[PDB]
Structure formats: C-alpha cells, structure tokens
Amino acid sequence: DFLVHHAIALGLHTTALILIKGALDARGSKLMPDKKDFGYSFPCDGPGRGGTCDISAWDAFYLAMFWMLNTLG
Amino acid sequence: SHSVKIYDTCIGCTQCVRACPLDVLEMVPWDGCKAAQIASSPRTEDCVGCKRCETACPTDFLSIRVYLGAETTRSMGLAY
Amino acid sequence: AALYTHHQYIAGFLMVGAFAHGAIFFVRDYDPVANKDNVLARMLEHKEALISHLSWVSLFLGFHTLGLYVHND
Amino acid sequence: MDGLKSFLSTAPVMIMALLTFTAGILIEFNRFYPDLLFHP
Amino acid sequence: TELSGQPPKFGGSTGGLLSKANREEKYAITWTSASEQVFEMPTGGAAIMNEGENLLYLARKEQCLALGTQLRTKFKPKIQDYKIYRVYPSGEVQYLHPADGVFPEKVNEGREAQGTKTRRIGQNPEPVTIKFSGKAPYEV
Amino acid sequence: ADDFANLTPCSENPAYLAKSKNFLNTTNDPNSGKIRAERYASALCGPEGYPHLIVDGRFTHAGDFLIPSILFLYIAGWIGWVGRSYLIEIRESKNPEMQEVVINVPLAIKKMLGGFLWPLAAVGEYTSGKLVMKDSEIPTSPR
Amino acid sequence: ALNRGDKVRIKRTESYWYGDVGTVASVEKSGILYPVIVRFDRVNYNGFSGSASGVNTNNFAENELELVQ
Amino acid sequence: REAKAKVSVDNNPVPTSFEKWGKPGHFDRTLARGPKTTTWIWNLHANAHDFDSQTSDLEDVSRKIFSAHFGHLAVVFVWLSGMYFHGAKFSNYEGWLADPTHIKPSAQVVWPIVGQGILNGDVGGGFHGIQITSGLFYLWRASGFTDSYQLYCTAIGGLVMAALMLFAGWFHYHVKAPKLEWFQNVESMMNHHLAGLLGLGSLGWAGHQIHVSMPINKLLDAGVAPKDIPLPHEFILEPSKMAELYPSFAQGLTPFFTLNWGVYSDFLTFKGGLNPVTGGLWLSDTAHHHLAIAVLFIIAGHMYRTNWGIGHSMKEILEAHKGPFTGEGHKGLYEILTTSWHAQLAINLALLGSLTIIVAQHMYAMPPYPYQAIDYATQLSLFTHHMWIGGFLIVGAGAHGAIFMVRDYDPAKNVNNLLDRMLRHRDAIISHLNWVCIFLGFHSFGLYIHNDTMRALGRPQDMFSDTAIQLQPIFAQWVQHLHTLAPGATAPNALATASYAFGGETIAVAGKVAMMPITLGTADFMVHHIHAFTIHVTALILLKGVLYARSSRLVPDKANLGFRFPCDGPGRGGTCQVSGWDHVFLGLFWMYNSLSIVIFHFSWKMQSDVWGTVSPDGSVTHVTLGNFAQSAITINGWLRDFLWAQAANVINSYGSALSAYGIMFLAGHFVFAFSLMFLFSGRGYWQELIESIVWAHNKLNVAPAIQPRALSIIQGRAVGVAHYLLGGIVTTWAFFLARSLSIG
Ligand code: CLA
Ligand code: CLA
Ligand code: CLA
Ligand code: CLA
Ligand SMILES: CCCCCCCCCCCCCCCC(=O)OC[C@H](COP(=O)(O)OC[C@@H](O)CO)OC(=O)CCCCCCCCCCCCCCC
Ligand SMILES: CCCCCCCCCCCCCCCC(=O)OC[C@H](COP(=O)(O)OC[C@@H](O)CO)OC(=O)CCCCCCCCCCCCCCC
Ligand SMILES: CC1=C(/C=C/C(C)=C\C=C/C(C)=C\C=C\C=C(C)\C=C\C=C(C)\C=C\C2=C(C)CCCC2(C)C)C(C)(C)CCC1
Ligand SMILES: CC1=C(/C=C/C(C)=C\C=C\C(C)=C\C=C\C=C(C)\C=C/C=C(C)/C=C/C2=C(C)CCCC2(C)C)C(C)(C)CCC1
Structure with a gap:
C-alpha cells in the first residue's frame, strides 16, 4: 500500500504538472510569447523555431488526459 | 483565409518573400530600417499557412506572423 | 467496485476539465491591469519556479518508486 | 597524439569510463559484503 | 487576353488537372526557353519544354510557382520571364505573378503596404480588452 | 512497549526461520545464504517471513534509512557541486561549449578531488557568493 | 548614448533574451526604429526543425535596453 | 598491382592522423563550429554515416563506403569468433555431442552474484548454464566439429580474419584508395560475385561436407561416439578410410572428368526425406545441392562482358527491353544503378530481406541441421529472428528508394523510361493498392x-469454421498433394518428398516429432489472408512514400524539402508526416504488426498441429492438443488460448532459471509504454518544460553553456518508433523463449 500510494502521488504530481504548465504558459512562453493571440486551441506554430508541436494549452489538456487515465488505472 | 501581419520590427531582408511558395508577400518601400523596405501581404487569399515566411525570419521573435483563419480550397491546398 | 471506479473516473474527468478551464480563462478572460500585483499575477510571475518544482517532485517520486518496484522484482 | 587524448576525453568516453568504474566499485562491494539490506 | 505558347512535350500522367479545372478554377504558367530542355513536372515525372514559348496548365497556384522557382534556379540560362495566371471556367484570365512585372523579392515603387502594423509584436491588445467582439489581437 | 503489534522480530517469526533455513547462496560463498539468514534475523518481519523496514525516524532503525540517506546526500552533493563548479570554471574559457562536450580531464579531476568539502563550500557560497542569484537578473518568459 | 561593448539587459518582454545579457556591436544612425545592434552568447530559437544553433544578434531601441558594463 | 587490369587507385589521398578524433563533428560543416544547443549532439549521430551530406564527391563517398564495408566485415568476424570461442571454452558441446537426446544445449555461464547465478540451470551431464536457442551445436555437428580445440581454432582464425578486414579497410581508404572508375565495373563485380564468391563458396563447402561433414556424421549417427571417430584429416591421409564409407571413393576422381557421375551415387544422393536417426536433411543431399549450386553460379558468373569481348553488356540488355505498354523501357537504369548508391542499396536490401524471410520459412519446415527439429525453442527462435531481420531490411529498402528519389533522381535522364511512367501513374497505383488493402482488411480481420460475434451470441453454425461455413484453402491442399506425389512420378530419382510438411510420414526422432503433415483448414485460410492484408498495407505505405517523395498535389516542391523533414507547416489543412522518412516511420509499425502476426501464427500452428510427443503406437499427442482449428478463428481465441494460456510460463518464471525471461517481458512492456510518450506528444510542450527547468538552473548558476533543446520532431518520431519496436519485439522474444523452453 505504501508503494502504490507513492505511485498515486507520482500520477497526481505529473498530471497536475502537465495541467499547471499548460495553464501558466497558455498566455505565452519563449517559443510563442504571444500564444494568447492564437487562442486556447490551435494546431501549432510550425516547424520553425525548432518545432512547435503540441504548443497550445489544449495540447496540455490532451497530454494530461493520458496521465489522468493512468492515475485512475 | 489566413492573416499575414508585418510589424515595425522588420529589417527588410526579403527572406520571407523568397521563402513563400504561393506569392503572398511583397517588398514595399519603407523608412523604418536600413534596407528602407518592409514586408507586405497583398495576396492573402492564396496563403495556405505553411509558416515558411516565419521560418525564414531573423528578428528575435518574428516580425511577420501568420494566423490561420477560415479555410477554403486555396488555403487547404486542394487540387480538386 | 463499479461504483468506486465510476466515481473516481468522474472525478478525474472533472479535475482535468477544471484545469482546462483555468487555462481557458488565462487565454480569454485574464486581465493583467485589474489583477496587477495580486495573487493571480504573482502566480504567473514565478511560474518557472512552480513548474520546475513540480518537475522535481515528479522526477523524485517516479525515479524512486520505479526503482523500488524494479529492485523488488 | 594530442587528438588521441582529446578523443579519449570526449563526453561518451568519459561517461562510460566513470560508469564502468562505479559498476566495478559496486559489484565488488556487493561481492565481498552481500545482502546489505539495512545497516545494523 | 488569350494565353499563347506551345504545350510542353509530355506523354501524360494521372497527376494533372481534375474536375476542379472546369468546375472551379485552373492556373497557367508561360515561359520562354533558350532550347528544348528537360524539366521536372510538379505533378510528377519529366517533361520537355520547347525552345521559344511554352504554355502549361496546372491545377493549383503553388504548382505554377514551384515550376517558376525550378525554371529560375535549375537551368544554365535562367528562365525568369515566366508568368502565372488564373483561368476561370468562363474563360476569364487573371494575371497573377509577378504582380507588378517585378519579382516581390526586391523592392519596387508603386506598391502599397498591407498587413503592416505600426506597433510591435508584444504590443498587441490583451484579448480580454476586445472580447465579445469579432476581432483578435492582431486585427485591431 | 507494544509498538508495531502487527510485526514481530524475524527471529521470533516462524515463517522467516523456515525460509531462512533454505535461503539461496548469492555469490561463490556457500555461507552467503547462511550469513544472510543471520543478518536479516535482526530486523522486524511480517507474517509472510520477509523483513519490513521502518523509516519512522527512530534511531533504533537508524540504519534502515537514516544512514543510507546521509551517505547518498553526501555523495550526490559531491557530484552536483563538482559538476557545477566545473561548468562555472568552463564559463570563462572563451570556448566553454566545446569544453563542455570535450571534457577537460585535468580541470575535471581537480574539481572532483576537491569535493569532500562540498557541504562547507556550499554555505560559503550561500553566505555571500554566487550560490543564489537575484531574480531580476535571470531571463524569463512573458507572463 | 550607448556605445560598443556596452553590456545591457533586454526589456522587450517578447524577446528570447529578456532578462539575459548582450553586448552592443553598433548603433545605426537616427531614423530607424530599432538601431541598437546587440549580439548575444546564447543563441535563440531560429532555424528549421533539427537545425544546429540559432541567431545571436538582434536590433533593439534605446528604450528597450538597461545599461550595465 | 595493375596486371593489365582496369584497376585505378590513388596512392595517398588521405593522411593518417589522430587529431580529427578530437574534433567530434569533423564530417559536417554545420557541426564543426562547435555545439551551442543540445541538438548538435544528436545530429552528430544522425549524419555519422550520411556520407552524401558530408561531401559531394561520389568517389570519396565510394571509398568511405568500401572501408566501412571492411570495418563491418571485421565486426561480424569478431562476433562470429566470439560465438566460436564461447562454444569452445564456455559450452557443453562435447557432453551434448556424446548424448544429444538427453541434454540441453547450454552456453554463456553466469557469474554467481547478487542472486543471478540462479540463471545457470542444469542442462544435463552436470553442466549448469543458460540454454541457447541459436542452434550453434547443431550447426557445428553438421560441420563435423568433434573437439572444443577446433572451435578455439575457428575463433582464432576468425579474429585473424577480422584483423585482416580492418587492415584492408584502412589500406583502401588511406593507402590505395580505388577510383570511381573501379566501382562502376558492375559487369566484372557481378561475374566475380556469382563465380568467385557464390560458386567457389558452395564448391568448397561441398568439398568440406564430402570430406569432413559426411563421413564423420555417417559414423556419428551409427553410434560410434565422438572420441572414437578419427580426425577429419585422417580421412584425407587414408583414402581407404573414405572408401570404407563410400566405395565410390575407391574409383577416385576419374569418373568425374569422364562424366561417369552415377558412380558417385554413394555420397551424392537425392533422398529428399529426413535422416531417421537425427531428423535433419541428409548431408549427402546437402553436398549434392552445394555442388549443383556451385556449378550453376560459376556458369552464371560468365555472362557479362569484361576485358575480352565475350559477354553481355547490361546496358544493351536493359535498353533492349521495351514494349507497347512501357515506352522506352529500362533505358537509363544502367546510369542509375552505376551513379547512385541508394538505388543499389534499396534493391539489395529488398532482395536480402526477402531472402532472409525465405530462409526462415525454408529452415522451419526443412530442418537442415541435425537435432534442430527436436528442439522447438531453437526452431521458433531462428524462424522469428530471420523474420524480423527480413522485415527490417525491407523497410530499409523502402527508405533508400525514397532517398534515391529525393537525391539521385534526375528527370533529365529518366525521359519515358519505366521509372518515369511509374511516377506518371502513381495515383492509379496507390489508389488501387489502397482499395486492395481495404478489401483484404474487410475480408480477413x-x-x-x-x-467472434457469432460465437458470442451462441450461433456456432453461423461461423467461418471447418464445422460450419468452411473456407477450405483448396489450392494449397492441391499443391501439397502434388508435392506428396512427386517422388516416383514428377520426381523420378528423388527417394522421398522434399519436405514432410506437405504430407507423408510423421517423422519423429527420440520421443518427440520432427516433422509431420501440416494440415490446412479454415483458420489457415484466414491467417494467410491476414498475412496478405498486413503485407499489402506495409507495402502501400512504403511505396507511396517512395513514389511521392519528389512531389504531390499537396506539396509540389517536396523534393526541395529533402528526404527527412517533419512537415511543411500546419497549412493546407496540415502536412505532418508528408516526407518519405515519415513513411518509413509508419511502415516500421506496420512491418512490426505484419511480422508479429506471422510469428504468432507460426508458434501456435506448430505447437497445435505439429509439435508434440509420440507414444509407441503411432499416435501423436501435440503440445497444445490441436486447439488451432476451433480457437484460431476468433480474436478471443488468440487472446485466451494463445496469449493468456502460453504466457503462463513467462509470468510464473520467477524462482527458476527463466526468471530473466519474466524480467525482460516486463521490460519490453515498459519500453513500449515509454515509446508511447514520444509517439503521442509534441516538441513544443517539452521545450517549454525545458525553458522552465533552464530558468531553475539559472537561479543557482548551473546553466550549461550547451543550451538544452527538446528532441526535434523527426528525432521524437525516431525515438518513439525505436522504443516501440524494441519493447514489443523484446516482449515477444521473452514470451516465445520461455514458452518454447517450458514445453519439453
Ligand atoms: C511507462 C511509460 C512512461 C514513462 C516511463 C514516462 C516517463 C516520464 N514522463 Mg511521461 N507520458 C507517458 C508515459 C511515460 N512517461 C505517456 C503515454 C504520455 C502521453 C503522451 C506521457 C506524457 C507525459 C507528459 C506531458 C509529461 C510526462 C512526464 C514524464 C517524466 C516525469 C518524471 C517521472 O515521472 O519520474 C521519473 C522518471 C521515470 C520513472 C522514467 C525514467 C526511469 C528510467 C528507467 C531511468 C533509467 C534511465 C536509463 C538508465 C537511461 C539509459 C538507457 C540506455 C540503456 C540507453 C518521466 C521521465 C512529465 C515530465 O516531464 O516531468 C518533468 C511531463 O510533463 N509524460
Ligand atoms: C573471386 C573474387 C571476389 C570475391 C570472392 C569477392 C567477395 C566480396 N566482395 Mg568483391 N569485388 C570483386 C571480386 C570479389 N569479391 C571484384 C573483381 C571487384 C571489382 C569490380 C569487387 C568489388 C567489390 C566492392 C566495391 C565490394 C565488394 C564487396 C565484397 C564482399 C561482400 C559479400 C560478403 O560480405 O560476403 C561475406 C564475407 C566474407 C566471406 C568474408 C571473407 C572476405 C575475404 C577477405 C575475401 C575472400 C578470401 C579471398 C578471396 C582469398 C581466398 C583464398 C582461399 C580461401 C582459397 C565479399 C566478401 C563489398 C564489401 O566490401 O563487403 C564487405 C564491397 O563493398 N567487392
Ligand atoms: C546495409 C543496410 C543499410 C545501409 C548501409 C544504410 C545506410 C544509411 N541509412 Mg538506412 N535503413 C536500413 C538499412 C541501411 N541503411 C534499415 C534496415 C532501415 C529500417 C530501420 C533503414 C532506415 C533508414 C532511415 C529512416 C534513415 C536511414 C538513413 C541512412 C543513412 C544515415 C546512417 C545513419 O543514420 O547513421 C547512424 C545510425 C544511427 C545513429 C542509429 C542508431 C540507433 C540504434 C541502432 C538503435 C537501435 C537499438 C539496437 C539495435 C538494440 C538496442 C540496444 C540499446 C538497448 C543500447 C545511411 C547512408 C538516414 C538518412 O537520412 O539517409 C540518408 C535515415 O533517416 N535508413
Ligand atoms: C486495431 C487498430 C487499428 C485499426 C482498426 C486500424 C485500421 C486501419 N488502418 Mg491503421 N494504424 C494503426 C492501427 C489501426 N489501424 C496504428 C497504431 C497506426 C500507427 C502506425 C496505424 C497507421 C496506419 C497507416 C499508415 C495506414 C493504416 C491503414 C488502415 C486501414 C487499412 C485498410 C483496411 O483494413 O480496411 C478497413 C478495415 C477496417 C475498418 C477494420 C474494422 C472493420 C470492422 C470489423 C467492420 C465494422 C462493421 C460496421 C462498419 C460497424 C458499424 C457501426 C455501426 C454503429 C454503424 C484500416 C481502416 C492503411 C490504409 O489507409 O489502408 C489503405 C494505412 O495507410 N494504419
Ligand atoms: C528491436 C530493435 C529496435 C529497432 C528500432 C529501429 C528504429 C528505426 C528508427 C528510424 C531512424 C533510424 C535512423 C537514425 C538516423 C536519423 O536521422 O534519425 C532521425 C533523427 C534526425 O533528426 P533531424 O531530422 O532533426 O536531423 C537533421 C540534422 O542532420 C540537421 O542537420 O536522428 C536522431 O534520431 C537523433 C538521435 C540519435 C541518437 C544517438 C544515440 C546513438 C546510439 C549509439 C549506439 C548505436 C547502436 C549500436 C548498435 C547496437
Ligand atoms: C480467378 C481466375 C482469374 C485469374 C486472373 C488474374 C490475372 C488478371 C490480372 C493480372 C494483371 C495483368 C497485368 C500484368 C501483365 C503485364 O505486366 O503486362 C505487361 C505490361 C508491360 O509489358 P511491355 O510490353 O511494356 O514489356 C516491355 C518490358 O520489357 C519493358 O517494361 O505491363 C503493363 O501492362 C502494366 C500494367 C501492370 C499493372 C497490373 C498489375 C496488377 C497486379 C495483379 C495482381 C494479381 C495477381 C498477383 C499474384 C502475385
Ligand atoms: C529527515 C526525516 C524525514 C524527512 C523530513 C523532511 C520533510 C525534510 C525536508 C526538507 C525540505 C523542505 C527541503 C527544501 C529545500 C530547499 C532548497 C533550496 C535546498 C536545496 C538547495 C541548494 C541551493 C542546493 C545546492 C547544491 C548543493 C549544495 C550540492 C549539489 C549541487 C547543488 C547546486 C544542487 C523523513 C520523514 C523522510 C524520515 C524521518 C525524518
Ligand atoms: C486533515 C483533516 C482536516 C483538514 C483538512 C484541511 C484543512 C485541508 C484541505 C485541503 C485543501 C484545500 C486541498 C486542495 C484542493 C485543491 C485543488 C482541487 C486544486 C486546484 C486548482 C485549480 C484547478 C485552479 C484553476 C484555475 C486556474 C488554473 C487559473 C485561473 C483560476 C482557476 C481557479 C480557474 C479536518 C480537520 C477538516 C478533518 C480531519 C482531517
């Protein structure tokens, strides 16, 4: 039970990290300092500046869904 | 169609026009940089949104920005 | 068993949705001048600390729990 | 020559050398004093 | 008016025009060649451009522009006099490229400035300040 | 007095004794199983026969977690401090990056050997050095 | 007023080096909105995906710089 | 070293030095300037062997390729010598040879430490180790190895050969570097590879089999025991020792030159069946086969014109082949396969992977090595191993076809040839292949x-089974019937069938079955159509990637983007994975899927309707009691009676010599799940997380000068697919090995 409660702690911490990082960078970061101008959900910003796949906060939601399902598992 | 805006941080290196694959951008005269020119987006109805103009931009964060809007045959790049 | 599983899954969905709507608020509704120097603006102002320390706690938990499980195996 | 030493001082060579050295340390420690679950 | 030029020597392919060219729109590239040369077709396979004038119909504008870049970057006497038009099913022809007879890479007088923002990137209005309107930070 | 009533010392647990009578040899030592059965009879065992570890913090079980914790903290502080000071000395070598890829062996060894005093040099740099940096002098992203 | 060699901090918010330090290389004459050429040690993000480094120079204005040495 | 040849080398083009070893990235001008971002590191490994992106000289590239070939041959020699030495001083090859039917082939002893010594299980005769499935002992017995000292000598010879190949690579890249003219001698190279490499190789191996393998094995099967067999060379020193086994030897090599070949019918046989003592192919048959193959290859190695007027010009042959349907035909293909390395690599990878899969299929049903059919673990392991090698080589063939399309394809030299017309109707090709894949998927899965739905609803009579609505593979049954009737009719001199898998006697050796008739029913029809479906989907992905590498209706300038690029932006609706590299990426997954279903079919069918024991009545009791017919027709059958059931050995492997298989089982599961993270996400999120962590390091001045960058999109994909394949293949490796080692 100790080991599995630490697994649950990992799951919660990681899912919340995804969600919080997505919400706090939703207005912008150093790849997209104007990410708020594009909206909550957009495909990306292109391969330029190194590649920008899964940049929006919606992509953070979609990532966090996997870890949430894993935590509930 | 997509919006292609240009800002005052333009240095007029003409790279985004050279990188455009659908002739959306032009080099018009200006007085805000050394090259005495600025980028423009007259033919935005032919923009597909490939972000190449942004990729070829040198300014610290782009001076030219592409915002994907209402999709059409031309923007979706359809040959049918 | 089915009741516990059902309601824990509902709770996971609700939590993910809560954080998604927090990010959506940040994208659409956040006013930096009317909320200047308040709790919200400070949360945004040290977002790197929060994200990095969530990263540390997550790496910590995962590293050590997976290490203990693999040792036991 | 100098280039041979510079190759021997690269990141992968140094990291694998340190990992092998630490592997030997730990393997010998657990060989002579095994099953050390906890300190008395 | 009437587009002139000989079609390139081509045996045919399945990548050419479809029903869009007659239902919706089509495009045309014209160019003069110093000799009978071999070029690559944007729709796949090789073709032979005639010496003199060449007229070629393509389905999309990006295809004509790819052909133009190839003409101007892959041949010993660079072909840069190419022109790209848009043809409609009513037979109407709209000249397109180069817009003002000069390539857009280099500055030329007479051109207006569109999409030019007087402000900086980071000086866009906050979305909350323009919400419940039909505009975005990059539009006001 | 009756603390941890669910657990009993491994010597007093019959399952542990039965299993330890058949513990397997680990190394080439034929008594490795015997010496393991003798060393693990000290700790507390469960109904199954395997020892449980107590991290409650009491110094009766100071070897279960406290001592490995202290040892690892010392060694990991050593590693981190020598790496950090190596990177910082690299910072002032005109070409710091290619010395970060190609490891300066003498400088690296000199930093590593002088690492046994990391917990003192740490507070030395914290009191009035470069350990902590002012927030306004650190590059950040838009909020 | 800034000259060559002036170590300065960038205040452009949207900049990749906002809060970082860069050295002035040259100042273009009047008229230009962003004449102060600042070179940097840390390359930015520019380049196609998978490319090596980035761009280590940009033009700013006087108002967007904080002076150090 | 001319000797009036076409040889042309440069006596000293590259100086020998060690300084460049200290400059990581010397081969790439974009990497020579030193790292600034972490990506610099990764690209250094990505372009390591990308000789085209390092220099535009075809000659220097050919020289690098030649020396790299020599280096790889040295590596394979080192590995082969390691295997031989481990069989020499670390294996029970002699205790096994003394009594194979009651001992397990072991090798690689484990040092007793931290508990791992448990992996050295008892294999027989008191030997403790890890049972090996590579089948090395069977191969060595077929070769005639009697003494471990000979395995040691083979290891020494292999290490000497490795040193030789390494010296040859160094000598031909630094000393005598051959010119570009020398590599373009495709006619000479072909003549030699047919006659010198293949012909002479099989000729010498037939000789070794006649003088070493056949006599020693003839005695070995009769129970003479190894230590009582004379050495292999005592048969060459004493001709009477060869004539006592084969009286045909007593007439000497006089009947050979006089075409009096029938005399040699003592040791050059056409028995066809299997050796009743050991369950392998007759070594007389294999020697006869190597002799015929050698003669064939030598005769073939004379077709092409070199330095004497006689021969075939491949350019004339290719250009002479053109019809009403294909325009100018194969014109320009000579110039392609002479000036492009990637075209050659694609063709050769394709044919080699196909040959490897063919090797697997031909060795599972025609066991060539003695006592290899008895051992089910070795059989399954070799089968799936060659299967995976072939699949990977085929995916690489697609990769290099696309690479040629992007880099070496010249439209000016491909005017209305086969390649031009293929590019001009690729739309028809790919649309019809799309339809064929859909039709197969609907009509197999x-x-x-x-x-599944019919059985679940309690309607067994509505199912596609042998007992309801039958899908009898009539054609394969007819061909099997023809094979079982060939000896004596359509194969007059052949004594037995080519293989008993088509039918005949249920050959069993010791207590187990070696090879019996493999029946084909409704489930076999369904599995074969699943195979066709998956192969078609993989080929569709790869062929579409090849044909559309240069251009498409979406991206008319794709060639200018290169072979390896993530995309061309979110425009045009979205253009991710439009490159040929990404087609290779997807074809990797589909190759994994195809081959996984193939090897699962192999395992279950062998264990169900072939493998098993035989009691002294003729009656055969199979491993899993013939459950293939009634269970391999639903997906629930594969889930329960194949995966759930046969994974019981792997999960309960703890506390035995197979606990490592359970460990690696869990490890492959973990690596698959780990790959999922690289496969489902995007680079931007990770770059933002790295930005936050970089700020955190800036807080304590631990900021590295090499700026941490997230994995590139292409690199993210490569990492994801690599971990996916690794995890899945290791999972099935552990599962198969444990299962086939826990079935007796
Ligand atoms: C079993 C699958 C798996 C694994 C191991 C990971 C691993 C990790 N994820 Mg992840 N994730 C997964 C599935 C997985 N993910 C899936 C399916 C998704 C949906 C796409 C995500 C999406 C996701 C997001 C969005 C995020 C993570 C984060 C993390 C990291 C958090 C640190 C941690 O959890 O503890 C510690 C680490 C581990 C337990 C795994 C590494 C342990 C290994 C075995 C150590 C040994 C290394 C090895 C020796 C190296 C040498 C190998 C050599 C032989 C080649 C971590 C490294 C979060 C993060 O980055 O935190 C900062 C983050 O934000 N994941
Ligand atoms: C009878 C002549 C002969 C022989 C046997 C070979 C054999 C070989 N060639 Mg070569 N080649 C030849 C003629 C020959 N070639 C000619 C005339 C040309 C000029 C057109 C070339 C140009 C050529 C190129 C450009 C390349 C090869 C390559 C190869 C190797 C690839 C196949 C392989 O890896 O198999 C299995 C490998 C082995 C069995 C290893 C043994 C290798 C030894 C050193 C060669 C055979 C021994 C030698 C003939 C002495 C035998 C004496 C005694 C045993 C009787 C192979 C060993 C490729 C290569 O280097 O691959 C590594 C390669 O890049 N060949
Ligand atoms: C004789 C066969 C052959 C030859 C010589 C080549 C040659 C080449 N290929 Mg090709 N290819 C092949 C087979 C071959 N390939 C196969 C079988 C596949 C299917 C996977 C491919 C798929 C393919 C792709 C997708 C690409 C190439 C590329 C290239 C070029 C760059 C080489 C490189 O990437 O550097 C060195 C290689 C690496 C750094 C990869 C290392 C990753 C390792 C192997 C992970 C695997 C794990 C390991 C096997 C087991 C796990 C161990 C672990 C736990 C420690 C090069 C000229 C690249 C290119 O751009 O072409 C110009 C490229 O993008 N090939
Ligand atoms: C089990 C998982 C799965 C399934 C269902 C599929 C499905 C499919 N893939 Mg796919 N794929 C997968 C995993 C999967 N993929 C993964 C993980 C990847 C990442 C590598 C890919 C990447 C990939 C590529 C690159 C390609 C495919 C292709 C295809 C199609 C093949 C054509 C075919 O078989 O006809 C159709 C078969 C089916 C639809 C199967 C389901 C049929 C059911 C049993 C019938 C349903 C009855 C009825 C309609 C239900 C009505 C419901 C009612 C409420 C109305 C097919 C639809 C290839 C393709 O497009 O084919 C041309 C192709 O190019 N896949
Ligand atoms: C079961 C076995 C598993 C098989 C899985 C095979 C995975 C196939 C994936 C396809 C890509 C493979 C081609 C890579 C070539 C390639 O281009 O890959 C794709 C990717 C390229 O990224 P970019 O497009 O950004 O590169 C462009 C640059 O050249 C810019 O100039 O390269 C990387 O993945 C970098 C990571 C290197 C990792 C370095 C680790 C080195 C490992 C050392 C040990 C090697 C193993 C030794 C043998 C045992
Ligand atoms: C149920 C009983 C009925 C069975 C009938 C099945 C056969 C009918 C369909 C076969 C296609 C005939 C066209 C090829 C005969 C053929 O190659 O003709 C020859 C012709 C080229 O010949 P040329 O005269 O140009 O020859 C000159 C050459 O030297 C230069 O290339 O090829 C084509 O016409 C291109 C069309 C090929 C595209 C068709 C391929 C379709 C795949 C068919 C797969 C089904 C069987 C696969 C089993 C492996
Ligand atoms: C003992 C104990 C415990 C615990 C407790 C706790 C809860 C603690 C804590 C704590 C905390 C709450 C902490 C925090 C902090 C902060 C910080 C901030 C720190 C860090 C820092 C730094 C600055 C570092 C540095 C360094 C060094 C020194 C070395 C290496 C390198 C580096 C740089 C990393 C337990 C129960 C388990 C058991 C019993 C008792
Ligand atoms: C011990 C105990 C107790 C106590 C308790 C306490 C005192 C506590 C609580 C605690 C808490 C109290 C917790 C928590 C929760 C949390 C959560 C659940 C989360 C989150 C958040 C979020 C999700 C956010 C969102 C957002 C954003 C992101 C932005 C914008 C804004 C908003 C909000 C939208 C008592 C005596 C009573 C009883 C017995 C036991």
Missing part, C-alpha cells in the same frame, strides 16, 4: 470479427 472482418471474418474474425464475424466469428
């Missing part, structure tokens, strides 16, 4: 779904 969909049949399984029908069976």
